[PDB]
Amino acid sequence: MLMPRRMKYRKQQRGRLKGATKGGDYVAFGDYGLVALEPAWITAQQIEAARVAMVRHFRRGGKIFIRIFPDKPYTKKPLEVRMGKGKGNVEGYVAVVKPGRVMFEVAGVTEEQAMEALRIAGHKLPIKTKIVRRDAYDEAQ
Amino acid sequence: XXXXXXXXXXXXXXXXXXXXXXXXXXXXXXXXXXXXXXXXXXXXXXXXXXXXXXXXXXXXXXXXXXXXXXXXXXXXXXXXXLXXXXXXXXXXXXXXXXXXXXXXXXXXXXXXXXXXXXXXXXXXXXXXXX
Amino acid sequence: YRLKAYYREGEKPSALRRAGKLPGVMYNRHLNRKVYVDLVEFDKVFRQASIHHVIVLELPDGQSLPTLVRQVNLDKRRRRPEHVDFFVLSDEPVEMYVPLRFVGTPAGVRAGGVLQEIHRDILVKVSPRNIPEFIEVDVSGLEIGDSLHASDLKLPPGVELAVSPEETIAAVVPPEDVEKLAEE
Amino acid sequence: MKVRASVKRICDKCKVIRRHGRVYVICENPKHKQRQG
RNA sequence: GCUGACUGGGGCCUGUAGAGCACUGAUAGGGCUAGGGGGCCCACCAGCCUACCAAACCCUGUCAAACUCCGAAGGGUCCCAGGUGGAGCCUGGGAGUGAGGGCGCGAGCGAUAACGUCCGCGUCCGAGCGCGGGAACAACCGAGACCGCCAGCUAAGGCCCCCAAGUCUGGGCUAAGUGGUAAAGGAUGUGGCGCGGCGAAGACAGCCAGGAGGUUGGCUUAGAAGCAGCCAUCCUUUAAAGAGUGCGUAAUAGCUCACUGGUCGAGUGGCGCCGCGCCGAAAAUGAUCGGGGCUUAAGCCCAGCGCCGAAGCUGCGGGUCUGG
RNA sequence: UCGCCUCCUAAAAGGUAACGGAGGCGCCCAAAGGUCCCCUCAGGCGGGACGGAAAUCCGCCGGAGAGCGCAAGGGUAGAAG
RNA sequence: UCGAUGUCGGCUCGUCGCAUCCUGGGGCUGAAGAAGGUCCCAAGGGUUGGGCUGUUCGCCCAUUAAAGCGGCACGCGAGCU
Ligand SMILES: [Mg+2]
Ligand SMILES: [Mg+2]
Ligand SMILES: [Mg+2]
Ligand SMILES: [Mg+2]
Ligand SMILES: [Mg+2]
Ligand SMILES: [Mg+2]
Ligand SMILES: [Mg+2]
Ligand SMILES: [Mg+2]
Ligand SMILES: [Mg+2]
Ligand SMILES: [Mg+2]
Ligand SMILES: [Mg+2]
Ligand SMILES: [Mg+2]
Ligand SMILES: [Mg+2]
Ligand SMILES: [Mg+2]
Ligand SMILES: [Mg+2]
Ligand SMILES: [Mg+2]
Ligand SMILES: [Mg+2]
Ligand SMILES: [Mg+2]
Ligand SMILES: [Mg+2]
Ligand SMILES: [Mg+2]
Ligand SMILES: [Mg+2]
Ligand SMILES: [Mg+2]
Ligand SMILES: [Mg+2]
Ligand SMILES: [Mg+2]
Ligand SMILES: [Mg+2]
Ligand SMILES: [Mg+2]
Ligand SMILES: [Mg+2]
Ligand SMILES: [Mg+2]
Ligand SMILES: [Mg+2]
Ligand SMILES: [Mg+2]
Ligand SMILES: [Mg+2]
Ligand SMILES: [Mg+2]
Ligand SMILES: [Mg+2]
Ligand SMILES: [Mg+2]
Ligand SMILES: [Mg+2]
Ligand SMILES: [Mg+2]
Ligand SMILES: [Mg+2]
Ligand SMILES: [Mg+2]
Ligand SMILES: [Mg+2]
Ligand SMILES: [Mg+2]
Ligand SMILES: [Zn+2]
Structure with missing residues (x-):
């Protein structure tokens, strides 16, 4: 999958999901990008499932830029166990994405391709998405 | 009207040497007969007697922006203008007169011509060959 | 590129937009006024104007002063403009972003790879009067390996730069085909 | 391809x-014939 | 005996929200560059190349309860002021209580499941299962019931009948009974904004004609002729016709659409939004939004006048507890 | 699991729970105490006999990242080292 | 609900759901026909007898148009066992 190589703490509280995006709202790298429209924990297996979908659509071509990173520990208690006895074990890792974050984005591929490519990856994600392309993203001078 | 602008501009410039500007019939041909008709007074008149077709609309505006109305007898419908800036006007016609009678079409298909300014006629085309 | 502006006294910015306008501001050494522009109209300009070309504003005083966007703040969600910063041009030397027009088919593409345009601009200081349009760039020749950058561009008359200039501006990276899964 | 949710x-x-x-x-x-259900 | 809660003005104490990487760690790509596969290798003296691995470091993008260069709102406390309250403070007598619960918000746990669980502030129930609304219903909305009245104004919620009061007045929306409660996801459902593109030098649809020569473009174990992956990525005669839009041959053939001629001779296709609706939608005794029923509404949205409506508030009479 | 210490959870005073998250203590020092006087680190880059990539040296550059008996935090070179 | 709500399986007796096993309608089929597959509509009525195990369940035997899957305090002990 995709996950941190080291850590200071193996497990962490759940935290909340209010707010916009904090950052990562403009294209920055490629020509097109997939933006999140709802709050959600995107799991490593979801990210992978999307990325492969990408590389799979446009076989041998362009560059894909995964911009979200699963570094937050997802926990789960053993099958059929009661409440108590301490915190559960790490089942996987997630990426906390809030409305507006540009999760993925492609480069070096025909427009038509960028579309169907990003559309598919959307389906793999557990939230509503929107495709876009460089615009007022030139945050400069 | 951005591409049609160049179209008319070109028709006019070409409509300059008005010596054999004629318009007749023998249509409904294939693409194989394309290079055919396009060989009449081109193998005796050279790059002087050619056959170019364009929008009737844009064509009827050309004749206005440079006197040559009277094309009322012949105007409506799908038409072609066998422009001949050089090479015998009556000779470049003695061609379009045969190929037509050859491609299987009665001696009835000639919609007037303008020889160096002069409204020809219908039957006045069956003679421009003989 | 003509874009009209209007003055703002000091009434709820939330209203301006809940209307159809886009609040903003004008400034440089001297002068700094709260202004605004029609949203749907400012967008049509910026789409091409961007921050690479000078946006000539106006006002009631019929004073068409030249400027260029210093920064546009977005809405994060809804992702649309929410405020603009207009920099009024003078005669003084100013630093701006001039678009890099990478022209040519890099040998690395036909071969194997994608032209990742690391930097589609480059802040450079210059004279308002003398503002370039686009700094062309020689891309052909770049193979799969590393790629040209920063200190490798034809800097027009009176236009140096505020870069490293080691800052890589482009690089050809091999393409991604098949064969995946490394964690067996 | 007859009765699906995505037509x-x-x-x-x-x-x-x-x-x-x-x-x-x-x-x-005839195959493409669909509905919704 | 004015010091109370609460409040105004000062002074600081602080590190949450947020944000941000300067610290501690986590981070994707790129550059540069110790190494190490290894590579041309003139062979020890270095060396050169590398769409692999890859430090440190810089650039672009980010991440944190146990990160913080930074940092609110607020909160705490002291001082000066308001504040006469079943306020406060001091001493003593009598206790009961030490199973709490729901709701909101901030965290943990949980699986951001539970009429779950554990803390934090608040609030109600508890003890207000007294009253009005919510069909019914401890804790949702309204409101703190001393007693009496065949008087009055209101609250929430209502004003077609059940059922007290508008079948009220203007502008819209919906056509499903949506309303009367589910998602991703679909769709020429409706209505309204946009912004571009084409069109009376004739667009859109339909119809009529053409839709060609380079040649079956090169490349494939069978073959691949416009229709499996690439280079060059173009030419020709042209009104206009691709090294081709689907259908289709084993492959050709065939039928097509890209484009334009021409009739016709007024608008017409593209996408981005917003409102309300359609499908998506299967569970167990008999059904229904509480019922009847309701469609320019008795639904939804937005203005307005007016009424109904509690044990709340007035009016009238009475009792009682404090203080003066 | 049961007492004690550090950090978080703890909602920027204090306090605050759960079989919540993550680590320590049940010692030690006669110098690791008192006072007086001096001294300033870690690393980075050079240059260096054996010298790993830190032995000890030399030269710049370096406000603290070193050090402070042991956990963690706070603190600290204008010293607590 | 512990000042008591009898607990598995069978028997008996039904009744309901539909996410349909058969039967009836129908679309697509890689549907020639016949026989299938799949999806949509549809419970009106049907949905066998045995061997083994307390069994539910399953595995077999022999048939069948079919030998459906679930609910009713895992229906039913003031009805039986
Ligand atoms: Mg006082
Ligand atoms: Mg006080
Ligand atoms: Mg105060
Ligand atoms: Mg913080
Ligand atoms: Mg935060
Ligand atoms: Mg204060
Ligand atoms: Mg009291
Ligand atoms: Mg007492
Ligand atoms: Mg207790
Ligand atoms: Mg309890
Ligand atoms: Mg308790
Ligand atoms: Mg309480
Ligand atoms: Mg409690
Ligand atoms: Mg409470
Ligand atoms: Mg909870
Ligand atoms: Mg509870
Ligand atoms: Mg709860
Ligand atoms: Mg407790
Ligand atoms: Mg109370
Ligand atoms: Mg009550
Ligand atoms: Mg009751
Ligand atoms: Mg009530
Ligand atoms: Mg009630
Ligand atoms: Mg009272
Ligand atoms: Mg009244
Ligand atoms: Mg009211
Ligand atoms: Mg009434
Ligand atoms: Mg719905
Ligand atoms: Mg939806
Ligand atoms: Mg109305
Ligand atoms: Mg009263
Ligand atoms: Mg009294
Ligand atoms: Mg605290
Ligand atoms: Mg606090
Ligand atoms: Mg001493
Ligand atoms: Mg009893
Ligand atoms: Mg059914
Ligand atoms: Mg059959
Ligand atoms: Mg049954
Ligand atoms: Mg019984
Ligand atoms: Zn079809």
Whole structure:
């Protein structure tokens, strides 16, 4: 999958999901990008499932830029166990994405391709998405 | 009207040497007969007697922006203008007169011509060959 | 590129937009006024104007002063403009972003790879009067390996730069085909 | 391809109709025939 | 005996929200560059190349309860002021209580499941299962019931009948009974904004004609002729016709659409939004939004006048507890 | 699991729970105490006999990242080292 | 609900759901026909007898148009066992 190589703490509280995006709202790298429209924990297996979908659509071509990173520990208690006895074990890792974050984005591929490519990856994600392309993203001078 | 602008501009410039500007019939041909008709007074008149077709609309505006109305007898419908800036006007016609009678079409298909300014006629085309 | 502006006294910015306008501001050494522009109209300009070309504003005083966007703040969600910063041009030397027009088919593409345009601009200081349009760039020749950058561009008359200039501006990276899964 | 939740066109000769209050996909080639359910 | 809660003005104490990487760690790509596969290798003296691995470091993008260069709102406390309250403070007598619960918000746990669980502030129930609304219903909305009245104004919620009061007045929306409660996801459902593109030098649809020569473009174990992956990525005679839009041959053939001629001779296709609706939608005794029923509404949205409506508030009479 | 210490959870005073998250203590020092006087680190880059990539040296550059008996935090070179 | 709500399986007796096993309608089929597959509509009525195990369940035997899956305090002990 995709996950941190080291850590200071193996497990962490759940935290909340209010707010916009904090950052990562403009294209920055490629020509097109997939933006999140709802709050959600995107799991490593979801990210992978999307990325492969990408590389799979446009076989041998362009560059894909995964911009979200699963570094937050997802926990789960053993099958059929009661409440108590301490915190559960790490089942996987997630990426906390809030409305507006540009999760993925492609480069070096025909427009038509960028579309169907990003559309598919959307389906793999557990939230509503929107495709876009460089615009007022030139945050400069 | 951005591409049609160049179209008319070109028709006019070409409509300059008005010596054999004629318009007749023998249509409904294939693409194989394309290079055919396009060989009449081109193998005796050279790059002087050619056959170019364009929008009737844009064509009827050309004749206005440079006197040559009277094309009322012949105007409506799908038409072609066998422009001949050089090479015998009556000779470049003695061609379009045969190929037509050859491609299987009665001696009835000639919609007037303008020889160096002069409204020809219908039957006045069956003679421009003989 | 003509874009009209209007003055703002000091009434709820939330209203301006809940209307159809886009609040903003004008400034440089001297002068700094709260202004605004029609949203749907400012967008049509910026789409091409961007921050690479000078946006000539106006006002009631019929004073068409030249400027260029210093920064546009977005809405994060809804992702649309929410405020603009207009920099009024003078005669003084100013630093701006001039678009890099990478022209040519890099040998690395036909071969194997994608032209990742690391930097589609480059802040450079210059004279308002003398503002370039686009700094062309020689891309052909770049193979799969590393790629040209920063200190490798034809800097027009009176236009140096505020870069490293080691800052890589482009690089050809091999393409991604098949064969995946490394964690067996 | 008959009764699904996602009814689209599949091919240039497929036309999206709507009768009996439902969305049907009508087309020359019988397979593409769809509904919604 | 004015010091109370609460409040105004000062002074600081602080590190949450947020944000941000300067610290501690986590981070994707790129550059540069110790190494190490290894590579041309003139062979020890270095060396050169590398769409692999890859430090440190810089650039672009980010991440944190146990990160913080930074940092609110607020909160705490002291001082000066308001504040006469079943306020406070001091001493003593009598206790009961030490199973709490729901709701909101901030965290943990949980699986951001539970009429779950554990803390934090608040609030109600508890003890207000007294009253009005919510069909019914401890804790949702309204409101703190001393007693009496065949008087009055209101609250929430209502004003077609059940059922007290508008079948009220203007502008819209919906056509499903949506309203009367589910998602991703679909769709020429309706209505309204946009912004571009084409069109009376004739667009859009339909119809009529053409839709060609380079040649079956090169490349494939069978073959691949416009229709499996690439280079060059173009030419020709042209009104206009691709090294081709689907259908289709084993492959050709065939039928098509890209484009334009021409009739016709007024608008017409593209996408981005917003409102309300359609499908998506299967569970167990008999059904229904509480019922009847309701469609320019008796639904939804937005203005307005007016009424109904509690044990709340007035009016009238009475009792009682404090203080003066 | 049961007492004690550090950090978080703890909602920027204090306090605050759960079989919540993550680590320590049940010692030690006669110098690791008192006072007086001096001294300033870690690393980075050079240059260096054996010298790993830190032995000890030399030269710049370096406000603290070193050190402070042991956990963690706070603190600290204008010293607590 | 612990000042008591008898607990598995069978028997008996039904009744309901539909996410349909058969039967009836129908679309697509890689549907020639016949026989299938799949999806949509549809419970009106049907949905066998045995061997083994307390069994539910399953595995077999022999048939069948079919030998459906679930609910009713895992229906039914003031009805039986
Ligand atoms: Mg006082
Ligand atoms: Mg006080
Ligand atoms: Mg105060
Ligand atoms: Mg913090
Ligand atoms: Mg935060
Ligand atoms: Mg204060
Ligand atoms: Mg009291
Ligand atoms: Mg007492
Ligand atoms: Mg207790
Ligand atoms: Mg309890
Ligand atoms: Mg308790
Ligand atoms: Mg309480
Ligand atoms: Mg409690
Ligand atoms: Mg409480
Ligand atoms: Mg909870
Ligand atoms: Mg509870
Ligand atoms: Mg709860
Ligand atoms: Mg407790
Ligand atoms: Mg109370
Ligand atoms: Mg009550
Ligand atoms: Mg009761
Ligand atoms: Mg009540
Ligand atoms: Mg009630
Ligand atoms: Mg009272
Ligand atoms: Mg009244
Ligand atoms: Mg009211
Ligand atoms: Mg009434
Ligand atoms: Mg719905
Ligand atoms: Mg939806
Ligand atoms: Mg109305
Ligand atoms: Mg009263
Ligand atoms: Mg009294
Ligand atoms: Mg605290
Ligand atoms: Mg606090
Ligand atoms: Mg000493
Ligand atoms: Mg009893
Ligand atoms: Mg059914
Ligand atoms: Mg059959
Ligand atoms: Mg049954
Ligand atoms: Mg019984
Ligand atoms: Zn079809």
